[PDB]
Amino acid sequence: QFAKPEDAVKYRQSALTLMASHFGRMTPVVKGQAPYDAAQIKANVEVLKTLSALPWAAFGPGTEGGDARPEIWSDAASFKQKQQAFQDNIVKLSAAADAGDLDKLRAAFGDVGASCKACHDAYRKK
Amino acid sequence: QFAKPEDAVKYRQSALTLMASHFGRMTPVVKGQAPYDAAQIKANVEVLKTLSALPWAAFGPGTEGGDARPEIWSDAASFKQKQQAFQDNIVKLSAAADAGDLDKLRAAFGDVGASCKACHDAYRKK
Ligand code: HEC
Ligand code: HEC
């Protein structure tokens, strides 16, 4: 859906910005600094689930640019590992949010965050 | 969820970028220049439905900035008109896509696009 590589870059940066906001806005809740409303978090994690499937299709071959490392493309199966592990941790976060279980939520949130960091460290330019 | 007004600006710009890509990527399909796969479009419109609910919460009071006109805030009921009319046209687009009806899709797509343009003309800075 992208006329030029720059359009893919702009899309994935926006998608990642929006994932990051829907993830990070739960940090006060996980920490107990903001109240836990199970319905609120269930709805937010449903939004995060949708968003977390979006960036990856905008790293199609030849879309080097932005802060993406070239190894995303040359190591395609490994980059796919990291994205798929991140989404299966999103599945676990959805299960926790759907269950309305704050302890399960905290644990799953931490797993997701670790998976963000793992891909970051390997595939985002310094 | 925004520490500073700039964060709300960045969020809504990203959300609008992503809406725009999920809307605009169907233009070749509507025009018949690309094939119509009903399941493909149903799934894409489900993504667009989620995205089209997101920008509005990031124009919270005092978030003047970006290309947003101040009248968004001073005319809150009217800006809410435009966003709500845009979403009820998204509901009609979802119905068309769920029905797998290319004629219904084309008509609903045109209605959505008109609603994008209406808010643009009133509330985006030139
Ligand atoms: C690889 C499988 C990734 C996972 C999982 C996550 N991110 Fe990431 N992110 C990744 C790349 C390769 C890039 C660079 C994209 C580019 O072309 O520039 C990024 C970028 C971000 C950004 C900045 C986006 C921007 O506006 O430029 C943010 C804020 C970000 N990523 C956050 C983030 C979070 C919070 C994640 C888990 C919820 C996460 N990312 C996962 C690669 C990957
Ligand atoms: C008001 C109810 C709007 C509707 C409906 C749509 N858009 Fe819009 N859009 C609106 C504003 C006020 C702004 C400026 C936001 C800011 O603070 O800068 C925008 C911006 C865009 C952008 C640019 C985003 C960016 O990266 O800076 C695009 C590409 C865009 N809008 C497209 C668009 C489309 C395709 C719409 C219908 C599917 C649509 N917008 C609706 C206000 C409103």
Side-chain angles (χ1 to χ4, degrees), chain A residues 2-126, chain B residues 2-126:
Chain A
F2 305 120
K4 296 178 179 177
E6 287 87 343
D7 298 309
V9 173
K10 285 156 179 200
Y11 178 103
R12 69 210 185 201
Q13 290 183 344
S14 289
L16 291 159
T17 293
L18 290 168
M19 221 160 69
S21 176
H22 286 275
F23 179 75
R25 71 181 59 197
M26 300 183 286
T27 298
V29 177
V30 164
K31 287 175 175 185
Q33 298 158 5
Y36 175 52
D37 174 326
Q40 177 185 29
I41 293 301
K42 179 178 177 181
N44 186 63
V45 175
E46 287 155 348
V47 174
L48 179 60
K49 172 184 176 201
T50 298
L51 296 170
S52 289
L54 302 180
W56 323 113
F59 295 87
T63 65
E64 287 75 2
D67 302 322
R69 288 184 178 154
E71 287 78 12
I72 291 175
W73 287 272
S74 61
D75 303 326
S78 292
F79 183 78
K80 195 171 176 177
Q81 289 161 184
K82 298 225 195 301
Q83 65 100 340
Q84 291 278 282
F86 165 72
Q87 294 192 73
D88 286 344
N89 276 328
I90 291 290
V91 170
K92 290 167 45 264
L93 188 62
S94 294
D98 287 355
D101 186 322
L102 181 54
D103 287 295
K104 290 167 184 281
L105 189 79
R106 292 201 309 166
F109 181 89
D111 289 347
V112 169
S115 195
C116 309
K117 179 177 166 32
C119 187
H120 175 278
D121 290 352
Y123 294 115
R124 177 166 194 186
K125 288 189 175 193
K126 293 189 234 105
Chain B
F2 305 120
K4 296 178 179 177
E6 287 87 343
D7 298 309
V9 173
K10 285 156 179 200
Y11 178 103
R12 69 210 185 201
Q13 290 183 344
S14 289
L16 291 159
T17 293
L18 290 168
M19 221 160 69
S21 176
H22 286 275
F23 179 75
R25 71 181 59 197
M26 300 183 286
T27 298
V29 177
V30 164
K31 287 175 175 185
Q33 298 158 5
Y36 175 52
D37 174 326
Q40 177 185 29
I41 293 301
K42 179 178 177 181
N44 186 63
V45 175
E46 287 155 348
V47 174
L48 179 60
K49 172 184 176 201
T50 298
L51 296 170
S52 289
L54 302 180
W56 323 113
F59 295 87
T63 65
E64 287 75 2
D67 302 322
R69 288 184 178 154
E71 287 78 12
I72 291 175
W73 287 272
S74 61
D75 303 326
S78 292
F79 183 78
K80 195 171 176 177
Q81 289 161 184
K82 298 225 195 301
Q83 65 100 340
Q84 291 278 282
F86 165 72
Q87 294 192 73
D88 286 344
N89 276 328
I90 291 290
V91 170
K92 291 167 45 264
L93 188 62
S94 294
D98 287 355
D101 186 322
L102 181 54
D103 287 295
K104 290 167 184 281
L105 189 79
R106 292 201 309 166
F109 181 89
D111 289 347
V112 169
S115 195
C116 309
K117 179 177 166 32
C119 187
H120 175 278
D121 290 352
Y123 294 115
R124 177 166 194 186
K125 288 189 175 193
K126 293 189 234 105

